[PDB]
Amino acid sequence: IQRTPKIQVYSRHPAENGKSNFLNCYVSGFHPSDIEVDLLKNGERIEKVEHSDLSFSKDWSFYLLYYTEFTPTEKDEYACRVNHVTLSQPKIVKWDRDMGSLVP
Amino acid sequence: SFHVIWIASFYNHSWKQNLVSGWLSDLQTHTWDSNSSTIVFLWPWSRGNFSNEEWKELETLFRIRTIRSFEGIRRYAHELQFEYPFEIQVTGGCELHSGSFLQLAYQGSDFVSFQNNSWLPYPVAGNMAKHFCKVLNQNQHENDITHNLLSDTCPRFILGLLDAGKAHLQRQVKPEAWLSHGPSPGPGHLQLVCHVSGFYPKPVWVMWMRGEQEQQGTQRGDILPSADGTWYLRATLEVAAGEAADLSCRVKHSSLEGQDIVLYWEGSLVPRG
Ligand SMILES: CCCCCCCC/C=C\CCCCCCCC(=O)N[C@@H](COP(=O)(O)OCC[N+](C)(C)C)[C@@H](O)/C=C/CCCCCCCCCCCCC
Ligand SMILES: *[C@@H]1O[C@H](CO)[C@@H](O)[C@H](O)[C@H]1NC(C)=O
């Protein structure tokens, strides 16, 4: 039978405006292996995104790591968009960054 | 601990996809190029103790068995009740200082496996897996070759490789850590997130603390890979909005030699005045 993908987003370093970083989307636990994963910057797809070679776990479910180098600013939102046969619609998982305290 | 995985996707009788890779412990060391039929060495020490002539035979052996597998699958697909599109996964390897394995899955479920000298069907996989073992065991000389690949050729590949590239598996890379707010908390609650990034090897200790008291509400996430060969982990703690005082994250890792990373929920995080 089929299995729906788990989607986890994280940056390699703490978010610092103007400093280059690496954005990661780790997709795991899905079956079959046919899947579409995009990294989003402000809602638009990021070109030049690397991903690891397809692999699977002991329960035969597949996993992948999508990543790209990036430089966050004060306004940019980042997310991971995944489409799979188990999904009715593409699921979007945001990169959860802390922009500091709000009230100046 | 070395093993090789196969991912064969059969979309129809005319469209296929074959993905092969080899793994030392947890580091991908080899990849198959479907075009040119060549084993791609990912690192200068991927070839190990073996010469160019032996690799040419290994490429040819895997070349013949792959062509023979894909043709045999499409020839017997109807008899085996294989309905397109389907996916077959294979994983096989070894380790000493001992064990050996070779498992095959159909549509992501246990189908058949190799035991000592022949293919045994998984009983739950039913008759179609017994029919599959009839075709896999039709040539005992091929099952003897498969045996020696697992018991002899595989541990020999670990020798000339796990000794040459032993330094990388024992490398100690210190983690970095930072704190942030988490999303999706309960009403009137906060989610405190402790990130631990860039450490190697994999074993790591991380807990939210109140001084010396470990906070047992610490929810440790999955250890996620990083493309530079290091690992990443999130540890979250949900607290009432008032009780977030004197909280800190403590990280223990072999590379730190007892000098734990300790970060305090403080500054703009609280936020102070
Ligand atoms: C890339 C990195 C390489 C690095 C390696 C360097 C270090 C090596 C050290 C240890 C490695 C050893 C551990 C791995 C041991 C491997 C076991 C093995 O070779 N298994 C073979 C046996 O096939 P046969 O020749 O017996 O029978 C052929 C068909 N007969 C009936 C028609 C004649 C087979 O299952 C897999 C073929 C390749 C998979 C591709 C196809 C996917 C579907 C696969 C199954 C489809 C079955 C079809 C049946 C009709
Ligand atoms: C490789 O094998 C040869 C024997 O064929 C041996 O002399 C050597 O010690 C092995 N390992 C190397 C060269 O790292």
What gap in Å lies between CA B105 and CA B110, rounded to an integer? 5
From residue A17, give the alpha-carbon distance in Å to each of A21, A72, A96, B50. 10, 5, 15, 49
Inspect the interface and report whether the beta carbons of A60 and B176 lie closer than 8 Å. no
Indicate whether B108 and B192 sit together in one domain: no
Which domain range does residue B210 map to?
171-266
Burial A4-14 (b: 16+ CB within 10 A, else e): ebebbbbbbeb
Q: Is residue B215 part of a domain?
A: yes
State how many domains chain A has: 1
Q: Do residues B131 and B177 both lie within one domain? A: no
Which of B144, B170, B196 is the endpoint of a domain? B170
Give every strand in the sheet of B261-264, ordered side by side: B213-214, B205-210, B247-252, B261-264
Do both B178 and B107 map to the same domain? no
Domain that holds residue A62: 1-104
Q: Are A101 and B271 in contact (CB under 8 A)?
A: yes
Q: Which of A96, A101, A74 is nearest to A11 (CA)?
A: A96
Is residue B273 assigned to a domain?
no
**Ligand 2 centroid, distance to A69 Cα (angstroms):** 40
Tokens at B16, concatenated: 């296929």
The verdict on residue B271 lying in a domain is no
Position B197 in a domain: yes
Cα(A45)–Cα(A49) distance, rounded to whole angstroms?
10
Interface test with B, best of A25, A27, A60 (most B CBs within 10 A): A60
Residue B200: DSSP 8-state? B
How far apart are the two ends of chain A, measured CA to CA in Å? 53
Where is the domain boundary, B170, B191, B218? B170
DSSP reduced 3-state for B269: helix
- Please state, as a whole number, how many other Cβ atoms lie within 10 Å of the Cβ of residue B48: 21
How many DSSP H helices and E strands does chain B contain? 5, 17
Domain boundary among B140, B170, B200: B170
| Other Cβ atoms within 10 Å of B71 Cβ, number | 10
Domain count, chain B: 2
* B8, B17, B223, A92: CA torsion to nearest 10: -130
CA B223 – CA B201 distance, rounded (Å) = 11
Which of B65, B80, B95 should be mutated for ligand 1, with most atoms under 8 A from CB? B65
**Distance in Å, alpha carbon of B104 to nearest chain A alpha carbon:** 10
Q: Is the CB of B108 less than 8 angstroms away from the CB of A61?
A: yes
Look at ligand 1, atom 28, and give the residue with the nearest C-alpha: B69
Extract the runs of DSSP E, i.e. beta strands, from chain B: 2-10, 16-24, 27-33, 38-41, 86-95, 99-106, 109-115, 118-121, 176-181, 189-199, 205-210, 213-214, 219-220, 224-225, 231-240, 247-252, 261-264
Point out the annotated binding site of B for a D-galactosylceramide: 65-69, 142, 146
In chain A, which among 64-83 make CB contacts under 8 A with chain B? 65, 67
Cβ–Cβ contact A36 with B under 8 A: no
Exp. method: X-ray
Residues 6+ apart with CB under 8 A from A75: A42
Interface of B with A (CB under 8 A): 5, 7, 9, 19, 21, 23, 28, 31, 85, 87, 89, 91, 105, 107-110, 176, 178, 180-183, 193, 195, 197-198, 221-222, 224-228, 232, 234, 268-269, 271
Contact across the interface for B227 and A22, Cβ inside 8 Å: yes
Six-digit token string for B174: 């210190």
Count of Cβ atoms closer than 10 Å to residue B139 Cβ: 11
Which SS3 state, helix, strand or coil, does residue B155 take?
helix
Q: What are the phi and psi torsion angles at B210 (to 5°)?
A: -115, 90
Q: Does residue B2 belong to any structural domain of this protein?
A: yes
**Would you call B108 and A31 a contact, using CB atoms and an 8 Å cutoff?**
yes
Domain identity same for B17 and B53: yes
Burial of A54 (0-12, 13-18, 19+ CB in 10 A): middle
Quick one: which of B138, B129, B145 has its CA closest to B92? B145
Rounded distance between C-alpha atoms, residue B108 and residue A1, angstroms: 7
**Closest residue by CA, ligand 1 atom 24:** B65
Judgement on whether residues B157 and B195 belong to the same structural domain of the protein: no
Q: Which two tokens stand for residue B114?
A: 């190799």
Q: Are residues B21 and B134 in the same domain?
A: yes
Which tokens in the block code for residue B109?
A: 């479920």
Contact in structure between A6 and A87 (CB atoms under 8 Å)? no
Measured CA to CA in angstroms, residue A13 lies from A17, B163, B207, B256, B257 at distances of: 12, 32, 20, 19, 22
Residues B10 and B108 placed together within one structural domain of the fold: yes
- The answer to whether residue A1 neighbours chain B at the CB level (below 8 Å) is yes
Q: Resolution in angstroms, to 1 decimal, for this deposition?
A: 2.2
Q: How far apart are CA B200 and CA B198, in angstroms?
A: 7
The answer on B219 and B152 residing in a single domain is: no
How far is the C-alpha of B182 from the C-alpha of B185, rounded, in Å?
7
C-alpha–C-alpha distance, residues B262 and B139, integer Å: 61
Q: Six-digit token pair at A31?
A: 């079956």
Residue B272 located in a structural domain: no
**Helix, strand, coil percent content, chain A, rounded in steps of 5:** 0, 45, 55
Nearest to A54, CA basis, from A21, A5, A1: A5
To test the pocket of ligand 2, the residue of B45, B49, B52, B156 to mutate (highest count of ligand atoms within 8 Å of its CB) is B49
Report the distance separating Cα B262 and Cα B214, nearest Å.
13
Q: Are residues B239 and B217 in the same domain?
A: yes
B82 and B102 together in one domain: yes
B193: nearest Cα among B132, B251, B238: B238
Burial level of B179, CB count in 10 A (0-12/13-18/19+)?
A: buried
Coil, helix or strand for B85? coil
A52 at interface of B, judged by CB pairs closer than 8 A: yes
Among A81, A8, A45, A63, smallest CA distance to B21 is for: A63
Closest residue by Cα to residue B12 from B77, B79, B72, B80:
B77
Task: Work out whether the CA dihedral B64, B69, B70, B71 comes out positive or negative.
Answer: positive
- Element housing A67 (H / E): strand A62-70
